[PDB]
Short mmCIF file of C-alpha atoms (C1' of nucleotides) in Angstrom, two decimals:
data_model
loop_
_atom_site.label_atom_id
_atom_site.label_comp_id
_atom_site.label_asym_id
_atom_site.label_seq_id
_atom_site.Cartn_x
_atom_site.Cartn_y
_atom_site.Cartn_z
CA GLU A 1 0.00 0.00 0.00
CA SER A 2 3.06 2.31 0.15
CA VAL A 3 3.76 1.88 -3.59
CA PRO A 4 0.40 3.19 -4.78
CA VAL A 5 0.79 6.13 -2.37
CA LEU A 6 4.21 7.06 -3.80
CA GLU A 7 2.55 6.80 -7.23
CA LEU A 8 -0.24 9.14 -6.14
CA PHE A 9 2.13 11.84 -4.88
CA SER A 10 4.46 11.57 -7.91
CA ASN A 11 1.66 12.59 -10.26
CA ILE A 12 1.79 16.01 -8.58
CA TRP A 13 3.65 18.34 -10.95
CA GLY A 14 6.94 19.34 -9.32
CA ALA A 15 6.99 16.30 -7.07
CA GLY A 16 9.16 13.26 -7.80
CA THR A 17 10.35 10.20 -5.90
CA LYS A 18 12.32 12.08 -3.24
CA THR A 19 9.44 14.40 -2.32
CA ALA A 20 6.84 11.60 -2.33
CA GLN A 21 9.03 9.45 -0.07
CA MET A 22 9.51 12.38 2.33
CA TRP A 23 5.77 12.99 2.37
CA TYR A 24 5.20 9.30 3.03
CA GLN A 25 7.49 9.40 6.07
CA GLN A 26 5.55 12.41 7.41
CA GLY A 27 2.62 9.99 7.41
CA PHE A 28 0.74 11.54 4.51
CA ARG A 29 -1.44 9.13 2.55
CA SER A 30 -3.93 11.19 0.53
CA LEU A 31 -3.91 14.29 -1.70
CA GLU A 32 -5.89 16.03 1.02
CA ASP A 33 -3.10 15.39 3.53
CA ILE A 34 -0.70 17.03 1.12
CA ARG A 35 -2.99 20.00 0.54
CA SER A 36 -3.50 20.74 4.19
CA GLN A 37 -0.29 19.78 5.98
CA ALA A 38 2.59 19.65 3.50
CA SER A 39 4.96 22.43 2.43
CA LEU A 40 4.37 23.17 -1.23
CA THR A 41 6.25 25.17 -3.80
CA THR A 42 4.02 27.51 -5.80
CA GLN A 43 4.57 25.04 -8.65
CA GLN A 44 3.54 22.02 -6.53
CA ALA A 45 0.44 23.91 -5.35
CA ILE A 46 -0.64 24.50 -8.93
CA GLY A 47 -0.14 20.85 -9.89
CA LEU A 48 -2.05 19.67 -6.89
CA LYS A 49 -5.17 21.70 -7.60
CA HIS A 50 -5.01 20.63 -11.28
CA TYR A 51 -4.23 17.03 -10.32
CA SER A 52 -7.20 15.45 -12.16
CA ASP A 53 -6.97 17.54 -15.32
CA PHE A 54 -3.24 16.99 -15.66
CA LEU A 55 -3.68 13.23 -15.64
CA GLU A 56 -5.98 13.55 -18.64
CA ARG A 57 -4.75 13.49 -22.21
CA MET A 58 -6.47 15.67 -24.81
CA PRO A 59 -7.64 15.27 -28.41
CA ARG A 60 -5.22 16.70 -31.00
CA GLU A 61 -8.17 18.81 -32.15
CA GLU A 62 -8.05 20.62 -28.80
CA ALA A 63 -4.30 20.90 -29.15
CA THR A 64 -4.93 22.70 -32.43
CA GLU A 65 -7.46 24.97 -30.78
CA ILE A 66 -4.84 25.80 -28.18
CA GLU A 67 -2.13 26.50 -30.80
CA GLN A 68 -4.64 28.67 -32.68
CA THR A 69 -5.27 30.72 -29.52
CA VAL A 70 -1.54 31.24 -29.04
CA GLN A 71 -0.93 31.98 -32.71
CA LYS A 72 -3.62 34.63 -32.90
CA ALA A 73 -2.33 36.48 -29.91
CA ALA A 74 1.18 36.48 -31.17
CA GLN A 75 0.25 37.47 -34.67
CA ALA A 76 -1.49 40.49 -33.39
CA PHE A 77 1.84 41.76 -32.27
CA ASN A 78 3.40 40.82 -35.61
CA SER A 79 1.87 38.87 -38.45
CA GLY A 80 5.14 37.63 -39.73
CA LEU A 81 5.40 35.47 -36.63
CA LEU A 82 5.49 31.73 -36.86
CA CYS A 83 3.87 29.47 -34.35
CA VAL A 84 4.33 25.73 -34.57
CA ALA A 85 2.88 23.21 -32.09
CA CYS A 86 5.47 20.48 -31.45
CA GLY A 87 5.78 17.45 -29.17
CA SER A 88 3.28 14.62 -29.62
CA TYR A 89 1.12 16.89 -31.80
CA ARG A 90 3.73 17.49 -34.49
CA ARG A 91 4.59 13.79 -34.31
CA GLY A 92 0.95 13.23 -35.24
CA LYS A 93 -0.34 11.41 -32.17
CA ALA A 94 -4.11 11.45 -31.78
CA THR A 95 -3.69 12.53 -28.19
CA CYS A 96 -1.46 15.00 -26.41
CA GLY A 97 -0.38 15.28 -22.79
CA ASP A 98 0.49 18.90 -23.27
CA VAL A 99 0.91 21.52 -25.98
CA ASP A 100 4.38 22.66 -26.97
CA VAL A 101 4.47 25.79 -29.16
CA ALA A 102 7.58 27.21 -30.82
CA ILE A 103 7.66 30.86 -31.97
CA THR A 104 10.00 32.60 -34.41
CA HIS A 105 10.19 35.26 -37.13
CA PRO A 106 12.02 34.85 -40.49
CA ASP A 107 13.64 38.35 -40.47
CA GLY A 108 15.33 37.17 -37.31
CA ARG A 109 14.90 40.23 -35.17
CA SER A 110 11.13 40.70 -34.73
CA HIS A 111 10.92 37.77 -32.32
CA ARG A 112 12.42 39.98 -29.62
CA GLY A 113 10.17 41.71 -27.10
CA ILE A 114 7.33 39.34 -27.93
CA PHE A 115 7.69 36.81 -25.11
CA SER A 116 6.78 39.12 -22.23
CA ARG A 117 3.88 40.79 -24.10
CA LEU A 118 2.49 37.53 -25.50
CA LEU A 119 2.10 35.98 -22.05
CA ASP A 120 0.59 39.23 -20.82
CA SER A 121 -1.88 39.18 -23.71
CA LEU A 122 -2.84 35.59 -22.99
CA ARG A 123 -3.29 36.32 -19.29
CA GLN A 124 -5.77 39.10 -20.13
CA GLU A 125 -7.87 36.71 -22.21
CA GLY A 126 -8.10 34.50 -19.13
CA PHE A 127 -6.37 31.92 -21.27
CA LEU A 128 -3.26 31.43 -19.19
CA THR A 129 -4.39 30.52 -15.75
CA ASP A 130 -1.26 29.77 -13.79
CA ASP A 131 2.47 29.92 -14.36
CA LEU A 132 5.06 27.35 -13.40
CA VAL A 133 8.43 28.31 -14.70
CA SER A 134 9.84 31.17 -16.71
CA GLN A 135 13.24 31.01 -18.31
CA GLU A 136 14.33 34.19 -19.96
CA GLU A 137 18.01 33.50 -20.22
CA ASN A 138 18.38 30.56 -22.59
CA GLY A 139 20.74 32.43 -24.73
CA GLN A 140 18.59 33.97 -27.39
CA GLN A 141 15.72 31.70 -26.40
CA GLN A 142 13.00 32.23 -23.84
CA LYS A 143 10.78 29.53 -22.42
CA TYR A 144 7.64 29.51 -20.40
CA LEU A 145 5.89 26.63 -18.72
CA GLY A 146 2.33 27.26 -17.68
CA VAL A 147 -1.29 26.25 -17.54
CA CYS A 148 -4.03 27.33 -19.92
CA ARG A 149 -7.71 26.70 -20.49
CA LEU A 150 -9.86 27.14 -23.61
CA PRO A 151 -13.03 29.27 -23.23
CA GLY A 152 -16.47 27.69 -22.87
CA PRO A 153 -18.20 25.27 -20.50
CA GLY A 154 -16.68 21.94 -19.50
CA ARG A 155 -13.09 22.84 -20.29
CA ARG A 156 -10.11 21.32 -18.44
CA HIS A 157 -6.80 22.99 -17.54
CA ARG A 158 -3.90 22.05 -19.83
CA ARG A 159 -0.12 22.06 -19.67
CA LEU A 160 1.37 24.61 -22.08
CA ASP A 161 5.01 25.24 -22.99
CA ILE A 162 5.83 28.29 -25.11
CA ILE A 163 9.34 28.92 -26.39
CA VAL A 164 10.66 31.79 -28.51
CA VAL A 165 13.72 31.34 -30.70
CA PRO A 166 15.69 33.31 -33.31
CA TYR A 167 15.18 32.12 -36.90
CA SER A 168 18.84 31.05 -37.03
CA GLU A 169 18.05 28.55 -34.30
CA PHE A 170 14.57 27.57 -35.47
CA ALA A 171 15.84 24.30 -36.94
CA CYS A 172 17.53 22.96 -33.82
CA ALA A 173 14.72 24.29 -31.62
CA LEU A 174 12.05 22.45 -33.66
CA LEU A 175 14.14 19.32 -33.51
CA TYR A 176 14.32 19.47 -29.72
CA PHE A 177 10.70 20.42 -29.06
CA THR A 178 9.22 17.84 -31.44
CA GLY A 179 11.06 14.89 -29.94
CA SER A 180 10.58 12.28 -28.91
CA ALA A 181 12.83 12.28 -25.83
CA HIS A 182 14.33 8.93 -26.76
CA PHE A 183 14.79 10.27 -30.29
CA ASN A 184 16.51 13.47 -29.20
CA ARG A 185 18.65 11.49 -26.78
CA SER A 186 19.70 9.29 -29.73
CA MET A 187 20.74 12.02 -32.15
CA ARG A 188 22.75 13.78 -29.45
CA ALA A 189 24.35 10.53 -28.39
CA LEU A 190 25.29 9.97 -32.00
CA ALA A 191 26.76 13.42 -32.43
CA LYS A 192 29.03 12.82 -29.41
CA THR A 193 30.69 9.93 -31.25
CA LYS A 194 31.19 12.02 -34.37
CA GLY A 195 32.99 14.61 -32.23
CA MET A 196 30.01 16.96 -32.43
CA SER A 197 27.32 18.18 -30.04
CA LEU A 198 23.60 18.80 -30.47
CA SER A 199 21.29 21.10 -28.49
CA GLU A 200 18.14 23.17 -28.83
CA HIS A 201 20.43 26.00 -29.92
CA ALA A 202 22.73 24.63 -32.63
CA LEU A 203 24.74 21.67 -33.90
CA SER A 204 28.50 22.15 -33.49
CA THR A 205 31.16 20.26 -35.46
CA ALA A 206 34.60 20.38 -33.85
CA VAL A 207 33.87 19.58 -30.26
CA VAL A 208 36.85 18.67 -28.15
CA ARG A 209 36.69 15.98 -25.57
CA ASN A 210 39.28 14.72 -23.13
CA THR A 211 40.62 11.24 -22.86
CA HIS A 212 37.92 10.55 -20.32
CA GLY A 213 35.55 11.98 -22.85
CA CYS A 214 34.46 15.03 -20.92
CA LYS A 215 33.83 18.06 -23.08
CA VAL A 216 36.61 20.61 -22.60
CA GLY A 217 36.03 22.86 -25.60
CA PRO A 218 32.97 23.88 -27.65
CA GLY A 219 32.89 23.34 -31.40
CA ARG A 220 32.12 25.36 -34.49
CA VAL A 221 28.43 26.23 -34.89
CA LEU A 222 27.15 24.87 -38.22
CA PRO A 223 24.44 26.95 -39.94
CA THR A 224 21.32 24.77 -40.07
CA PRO A 225 18.38 26.57 -41.73
CA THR A 226 16.09 23.50 -41.75
CA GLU A 227 15.74 20.21 -39.90
CA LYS A 228 16.85 18.28 -43.00
CA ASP A 229 20.23 20.06 -42.79
CA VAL A 230 20.81 18.73 -39.29
CA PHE A 231 20.09 15.11 -40.24
CA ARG A 232 22.30 15.44 -43.33
CA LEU A 233 25.29 16.82 -41.42
CA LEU A 234 25.07 13.93 -38.96
CA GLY A 235 25.14 11.28 -41.69
CA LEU A 236 21.52 10.33 -41.12
CA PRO A 237 18.58 9.62 -43.38
CA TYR A 238 15.93 12.28 -42.66
CA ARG A 239 12.93 11.30 -40.53
CA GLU A 240 9.57 12.99 -40.45
CA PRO A 241 8.08 13.99 -37.16
CA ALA A 242 5.78 11.04 -37.40
CA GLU A 243 8.78 8.77 -37.67
CA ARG A 244 10.39 10.35 -34.71
CA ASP A 245 8.09 8.85 -32.15
CA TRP A 246 10.49 6.58 -30.37
"C1'" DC B 1 20.28 17.61 -5.33
"C1'" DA B 2 15.42 17.39 -7.36
"C1'" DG B 3 12.41 17.91 -11.06
"C1'" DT B 4 11.49 19.28 -15.39
"C1'" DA B 5 11.30 19.77 -20.98
"C1'" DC B 6 12.02 16.99 -25.35
"C1'" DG C 1 22.00 14.17 -23.98
"C1'" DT C 2 21.50 18.61 -23.21
"C1'" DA C 3 20.04 21.97 -20.01
"C1'" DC C 4 16.98 25.16 -17.62
"C1'" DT C 5 14.91 26.72 -12.51
"C1'" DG C 6 13.14 25.25 -7.77
#
DNA sequence: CAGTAC
DNA sequence: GTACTG
C-alpha cells in the first residue's frame, strides 16, 4: 500500500520520488493530507489543484485549438510570426499530454520583445491561468511553462510550454521540441561519437573531448536553416516527425 | 540535489 | 544528452 501512495504523490507536478518518499514518512497518505499539511512550492500547489486535469490526455483537435489561440495572440503583435505546435502533436499522435508551441520570425529580429507581451496578452484573455516556470536567459531563447484553459463550458486545464527562438536557431529548436525524448537522446548521443554536439540552440562540429571523454572545448556552430540540414550533417537519413516517435 | 522539458 | 529553474 506504500507503492500506490508514492505513485499518487508523484503525479503532482513538481513532485518526484524524493518528495513523495519524504511525504510518506511524514505519514501523509492522501492528496488532502498534502494539501492541508505539506509544504508546497508555488509550482507544486498548482499541480495539486489541477491534479485530475493533468492526468488527462487531450484530443489533438483541442491541441490545435490551443495552438490557434496562441498563434492569434502572437500574430497580433506581428503577423510575420510563426507558431508551430510540437511534441506529440507534431509527431501526429491522436492525443497530447500537453501543448508545446515554438515561436519565431524569419527576419530574425522581430521575435524579440514578444515573449513578455504575449504571455501578458494571454493572461488578459483569461487563457493562461497559472504559471510554473519562466526562463528568460536561454541564450537567445525564452521559455515559459504554464497552464491554460480554452473558453467555454466543460473545459479542463492544460499544460502549455511556449518557447521563442531566433530564426537562425529555429531548426535545432524544432528538432528538440518535437522529440521524442528517446529520439533526441539518440541524435545527441550519435553526435558525441562524431565529435560533435547537439542542443536546442545549434549543432556544433569540432567539439573537443578529453581522454575521459568530458567536453573541454565547444565546437564550431554549423548553420542549419532546416531540420533536414541537421540530419544530413550527422550522416543520417531524414525522418519525419511522425517517424520520430520513439 | 530534485524535477522538469524533449 | 543537453540543459533550464526550484
